[PDB]
Design a protein around this ligand. Structure first.
Ligand code: CL
Ligand code: CL
Ligand code: MG
Ligand code: MG
Ligand code: MG
Ligand code: MG
Ligand code: MG
Ligand code: MG
Ligand code: MG
Ligand code: MG
Ligand code: MG
Ligand code: NA
Ligand code: NA
Ligand code: NA
Ligand code: NA
Ligand code: NA
Ligand code: NA
Lengths: 186, 95, 154, 140, 156
RNA sequence: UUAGGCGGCCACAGCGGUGGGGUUGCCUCCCGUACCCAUCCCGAACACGGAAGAUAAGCCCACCAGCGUUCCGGGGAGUACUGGAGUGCGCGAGCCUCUGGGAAACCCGGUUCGCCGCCACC
RNA sequence: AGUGCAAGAGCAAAAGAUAGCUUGACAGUGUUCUUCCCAACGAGGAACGCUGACGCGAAAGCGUGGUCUAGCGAACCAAUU
RNA sequence: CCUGUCAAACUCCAAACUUACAGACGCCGUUUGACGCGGGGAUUCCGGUGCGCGGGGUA
C-alpha cells in the first residue's frame, strides 16, 4: 500500500477469516477437517479435504435444512448445533468418510460450546474424531434443557410465536431419533 | 571465508524479498510426494524447520522414502551421492 | 545445411570448444563437415565461430567437393557417381548432394565418413585473425563466399 | 438511515494516575464496581523504575453504570470544545473519559471478520457535542 | 604527493564511512558560486567536460575551482553569473606509510571519480563568456584533458 | 454465490473514494443475561439465549486510477554491461571491430479497484 | 519494537508481550548432513526419526534447551552412576 | 517545492553468466566393455607465464 517494500497479508488474514498458524497445525493430521462454524441465526458443519486448487467439501449440514426433517424450533442454539453435526456426520459416513479433526476456526474452545456440540454430534454419527469428553456439554444442555428452564422463569414466552410456550427438549429427541435410521439425503 | 559455519555466505539465499516477508502459506508445507518424484530444493526463508545445508540450495533430487514427516531426498554433490532430510516446506515438484 | 571448415588449430583453444568441433566430427585443420541448420547445431557452430569457416554451399560446389573429397566409412574407395549409385539411395553424386542440402539425409546415413578432409586453400585464404566482414576468413560466409573457399580447397 | 447512525456512550473510564493504591476505594464507590491496577512501563527517575508495579487504577463503566455515573460527573465539569476528540470523545477532571461512537462498532471489536470503522461512519467532534449537549447541559 | 598515486580508478569503491574513520576534511570551499540566489535563467551555459575517467583529489578540485572562480572576477565579486562544481569527493584514499607486511594503508584523503564525458563544472553567463577562460585555467589543474562545451548558446 | 461457509494464488487482490442492496428466505449490525462460558474491572470481548428494529457500519453488487502494485506498447536503447575471437587503436588508463546475449532509471500511452477451486443456496 | 551477546538472517491472531501451568535442558537407540564442497579424516555440532516416560492443549499438535549460524577437548589415570 | 552528488561490508530493480535435474541432437560404449565396483603400484603437496576477473600495494 505504502510502497514497493510494503507487505500485504494474505487475503484470508486481511478478511480476518483464517488463522493460518492454526490451519497448518490442523492439516498436519492429514485427516479431513470437521469445519464447525456459527452465525447469529444458524450453525454449519462441513467435512473438508485438501485440494489442488483449494479445499474440497465432501459432506456438509446447515442448521436451516434441519427443518427439512421436522425441526420447528430456532436454529441458533445448542440442540440445533448438535443435530447439524450429527446430520453432517451421517452424510459424511455415506460419502465414505471415517475420521476428522475439529476445526473451530476463529471461535473459542469454551467448554460446552456449540462447536463442541457440533463435534459431539458428528462423533455420534459414526465419525472418529480426536476429542475430550469433559469439555463437552452434559447432554441435558445439549437437549435444550437450559432453555426450557429459562422459559420456566416465563411471564412472557421466550419464543415470539414460534412453536410452544414452554419449549421442547423432547422435540430434540424426536429429531435425533429420526436421523438415526433411513430417511433421504443420509 | 573468514569463518566456516553453515550460514557462511548465506545472506542472500536465506533472505526474503521484502514482499515475500512473513509466514508462508501452509499448502506447500503439507504437499505430499511419492518415491521417485523429482523435487527442487530451496529453503524458505520464512520456515525455520525442515531445512538442509544451504550448500544444497538449487539441487534437484529424487524423493526416496521419508523419515517422520520429513522426506529423504537423494542428490549428487559434485560426484558424491548424498541423502538429504527435508520437509515439504522446502521442496517443489519438478516440471 | 552449412559447410564447416576448421581453419584454426587446437593449441590454445578452449577445451569445451575443441570438444564441440570433435562432436561435429572435425579433428584436424582443414577438415570439413556438413551440418543441418537446427537450434541444437546452431548453438554449436556459434560456439566454434572463431576457429572455423561456415556457410551454405551451392549445389555445384558441394558436388565438386563430394566427388573430390568424400570417403566411405572405411577404406580408400573413391566416391564417384557409380560408388554413390551402387552404395547409396541416390543414383549419383548430384542426387546425394541435393539430399544433403535439403537435409534429408547425412554422410553417415549413406555409409560415408562424416568428414571431408579438404586440401590447403590454393592461393591461400583471407587470414585467421579476422572475420569475413573484416577481410579475414573466419565466421559465416556467403554462399559465394563459402564456395570460393571450398573450391580452393577442392 | 438514522437510529443506527445516532451516537451512544460506550464505556467511561475513570482512572487515578497516582505514582505508586488506597485510592481504589473511592473509585469503587464513585462508580460502583471494582477498580483495576495500573502497572507502568519503563524505568524512570521519579523513583519509578519498577516495570510491573501498581501506580494507579481505572474503571471501565458500560451501559447504565456509565450513565448513572455521568449523571453527576458531567455536572462537576464545565469545559467543552477543543477539549474534544477528533473521534468525538472527551476527557475531563482524577480523570473521567467518555468514549462515544455509533451502533455498528462491534464490527471493529469482534474476533471474526473484524474491520476498522469507515471514516464516514466515524463520529465527528461536532456530531458528538450535539448528542451530549442534548443531554443535560451546554457545550463550550 | 603526486596525482600519479591516485588518479586511476583501479581500486574498489571505498566510501562507507560506517567502516572508515579518520577521513580528512575536504578542502573544497563551495560548490555553488556567483549569484546562487538566482536560478539558471541565463542565455548561455558553458560546461567543463572531463575526457577520461579519472579520480580527482579534493586537492585538485579546490585548486581547479579557485583558479576558475577567482578569475571569474573579470565580472566582479557580485557579478551576474553562477558557477557549479557538480562532483563531490566520496572515494576515500589510503597510503601505506613494516614494508609490505600489513600494508592496508591509512586514510590520507578523498577524491572524486569522474567518468569521461561528464561535466565537472557548469557556468551560467549572459553573452559574456569570460567563463571560457576561467576554464582554460581550471582544466589546467586537473589530471585529464578536457573539453570546454557550450550548450544553450547559438549566439556565435 | 438477491448478501453464505472452507480455501488456492498471496497487492492484478493494497490505500483512498462514489453509487446501489434486503416485503417470507441468508449475513450482519441489533436485543438481551437464567443457564455452559467469560472480563487481573466492565455480557466491551469471549460465551450463551433470542428477533423489537435497521440496511447506517460490515458484507455482497456496480464503478472511479489520485497513491501503491502487475503486465504491455512506444521512446530511452540494441544504449549500460557482457560469454567467445582479433599481429584492430592507444604512452597508458583504456578503447574498437566481429560473434552470441542484453539491462536499469525515467517519460508518454494502455492494463490493474482481483482471478480461480470445492460445498451449500429461489 | 522486541526476541541474553558479533554480524547477517527469521518472526505479528508470532518466534515478540502479559498471565498461568510445567520441567522435553528426559532415558535409550538410530537415520542423515556437517565438521572435511567436490573427496578420505576424529571430537564436536545440527537436522530428522524410532522406543520408553512425561508436560501442556478441546484437539490437530507442540516440547530431542534458548528463532538460526560461535560458547569447545583424545588415549592413559582418578572419582562418580 | 526546487536544486548538486555517492556505496566492497546499500538495494525498488537487474543482466551476460555459472549451476541442479530432465528430454532432444550430437559424440561415445555394448569382440576397443563404456558408466561403475574391488584391489596392487606410484609420483606429487617449492611451481611458473599469458589472458579474463580480481584483493593488497606509489609501483
Ligand atoms: Cl464460526
Ligand atoms: Cl542437508
Ligand atoms: Mg553476495
Ligand atoms: Mg577411412
Ligand atoms: Mg604458393
Ligand atoms: Mg595470412
Ligand atoms: Mg448502504
Ligand atoms: Mg530450536
Ligand atoms: Mg597424559
Ligand atoms: Mg569425577
Ligand atoms: Mg560464480
Ligand atoms: Na514467507
Ligand atoms: Na614488523
Ligand atoms: Na589536464
Ligand atoms: Na496484579
Ligand atoms: Na449495510
Ligand atoms: Na560426528
Amino acid at each position: 500500500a505504502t510502497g514497493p517494500r510494503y507487505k500485504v497479508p494474505m487475503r484470508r488474514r486481511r478478511e480476518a477469516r483464517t488463522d493460518y498458524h492454526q490451519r497448518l497445525r490442523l492439516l498436519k493430521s492429514g485427516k479431513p477437517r470437521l469445519v464447525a462454524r456459527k452465525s447469529n441465526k444458524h450453525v454449519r458443519a462441513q467435512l473438508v479435504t485438501l485440494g489442488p486448487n483449494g479445499d474440497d467439501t465432501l459432506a456438509s449440514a446447515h442448521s436451516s435444512d434441519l427443518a427439512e426433517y421436522g425441526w420447528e424450533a430456532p436454529t441458533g442454539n445448542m440442540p440445533s448445533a448438535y443435530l447439524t453435526g450429527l446430520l453432517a456426520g451421517l452424510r459424511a459416513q455415506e460419502a465414505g468418510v471415517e475420521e476428522a479433526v475439529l476445526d473451530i476456526g476463529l471461535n473459542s474452545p469454551t467448554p460446552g460450546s456449540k462447536v463442541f456440540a457440533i463435534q459431539e454430534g458428528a462423533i455420534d454419527a459414526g465419525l472418529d474424531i480426536p476429542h475430550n469428553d469433559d469439555v463437552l456439554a452434559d447432554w441435558q444442555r445439549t437437549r435444550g434443557a437450559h432453555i426450557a428452564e429459562y422459559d420456566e422463569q416465563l411471564e412472557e414466552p421466550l419464543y415470539s410465536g414460534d412453536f410452544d410456550a414452554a419449549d421442547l427438549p423432547e422435540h430434540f429427541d424426536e429429531l435425533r431419533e429420526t436421523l438415526l435410521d433411513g430417511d433421504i439425503e443420509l | 571465508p573468514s569463518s566456516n559455519g553453515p550460514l557462511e555466505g548465506t545472506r542472500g539465499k536465506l533472505k526474503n524479498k521484502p514482499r515475500d516477508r512473513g509466514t508462508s502459506p501452509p499448502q506447500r508445507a503439507v504437499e505430499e510426494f511419492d518415491d521417485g518424484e523429482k523435487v527442487h530444493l530451496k529453503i524458505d526463508p520464512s520456515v525455520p524447520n525442515g531445512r538442509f545445508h544451504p550448500r544444497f540450495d538449487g539441487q534437484t533430487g529424487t524423493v526416496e522414502g521419508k523419515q517422520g514427516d520429513a522426506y529423504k531426498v537423494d542428490i549428487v554433490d559434485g560426484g558424491k551421492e548424498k541423502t538429504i532430510i527435508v520437509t515439504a516446506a522446502h521442496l517443489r515438484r519438478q516440471e | 545445411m552449412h559447410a564447416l571448415v576448421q581453419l584454426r588449430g587446437e593449441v590454445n583453444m578452449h577445451t569445451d570448444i575443441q570438444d564441440t568441433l570433435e562432436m561435429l566430427n572435425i579433428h584436424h585443420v582443414n577438415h570439413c563437415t556438413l551440418v543441418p541448420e537446427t537450434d541444437a547445431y546452431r548453438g554449436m557452430v556459434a560456439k566454434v565461430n572463431d576457429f572455423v569457416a561456415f556457410g551454405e554451399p551451392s549445389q555445384e560446389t558441394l558436388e565438386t567437393v563430394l566427388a573430390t573429397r568424400a570417403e566411405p566409412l572405411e577404406g580408400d574407395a573413391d566416391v564417384d557417381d557409380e560408388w554413390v549409385a551402387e552404395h547409396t539411395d541416390y543414383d549419383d553424386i548430384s542426387g546425394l548432394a541435393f539430399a544433403l542440402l535439403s537435409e534429408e539425409t547425412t554422410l553417415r546415413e549413406q555409409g560415408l565418413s562424416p568428414t571431408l578432409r579438404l586440401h590447403p586453400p590454393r592461393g591461400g585464404h583471407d587470414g585467421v585473425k579476422h572475420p569475413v566482414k573484416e577481410g579475414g576468413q573466419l565466421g559465416k560466409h556467403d554462399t559465394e563466399g563459402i564456395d570460393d573457399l571450398l573450391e580452393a580447397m577442392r | 438511515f438514522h437510529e443506527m447512525r445516532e451516537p451512544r456512550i460506550e464505556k467511561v473510564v475513570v482512572h487515578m494516575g497516582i505514582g505508586h493504591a488506597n485510592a481504589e476505594d473511592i473509585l469503587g464507590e464513585i462508580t460502583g464496581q471494582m477498580p483495576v491496577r495500573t502497572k507502568a512501563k519503563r524505568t524512570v527517575g521519579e523513583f519509578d523504575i519498577r516495570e510491573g508495579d501498581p501506580i494507579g487504577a481505572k474503571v471501565t463503566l458500560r451501559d447504565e453504570m456509565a450513565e448513572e455515573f455521568l449523571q453527576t460527573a458531567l455536572p462537576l465539569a464545565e469545559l467543552a470544545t477543543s477539549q474534544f476528540d477528533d473521534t468525538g470523545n472527551f476527557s475531563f477532571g482524577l480523570d473521567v473519559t467518555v468514549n462515544l461512537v455509533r451502533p455498528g462498532y462491534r464490527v471493529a471489536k469482534r474476533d471474526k471478520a473484524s474491520r476498522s470503522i469507515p471514516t464516514k461512519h466515524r463520529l465527528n467532534p461536532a456530531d458528538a457535542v450535539a448528542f451530549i449537549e442534548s443531554t443535560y447541559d451546554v457545550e463550550v | 604527493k603526486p596525482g600519479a598515486m591516485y588518479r586511476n580508478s583501479s581500486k574498489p569503491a571505498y566510501t562507507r564511512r560506517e567502516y572508515i574513520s579518520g577521513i580528512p576534511g575536504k578542502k573544497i570551499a563551495q560548490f555553488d558560486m556567483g549569484n546562487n540566489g538566482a536560478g539558471p535563467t541565463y542565455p548561455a551555459q558553458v560546461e567543463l567536460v572531463v575526457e577520461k575517467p579519472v579520480q580527482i583529489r579534493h586537492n585538485a578540485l579546490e585548486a581547479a575551482r579557485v583558479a576558475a572562480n577567482r578569475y571569474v572576477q573579470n565580472s566582479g565579486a557580485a557579478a551576474n553569473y553562477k558557477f557549479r562544481i557538480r562532483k563531490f569527493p566520496f572515494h576515500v584514499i589510503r597510503e601505506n606509510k613494516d614494508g609490505m607486511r600489513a600494508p592496508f594503508g591509512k586514510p590520507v584523503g578523498t577524491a572524486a571519480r569522474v567518468h569521461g564525458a561528464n561535466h565537472i563544472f557548469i557556468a551560467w553567463v549572459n553573452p559574456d563568456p569570460n567563463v571560457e577562460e576561467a576554464w582554460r585555467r581550471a582544466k589546467m589543474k586537473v589530471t585529464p584533458t578536457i573539453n570546454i562545451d557550450s550548450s544553450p548558446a547559438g549566439n556565435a
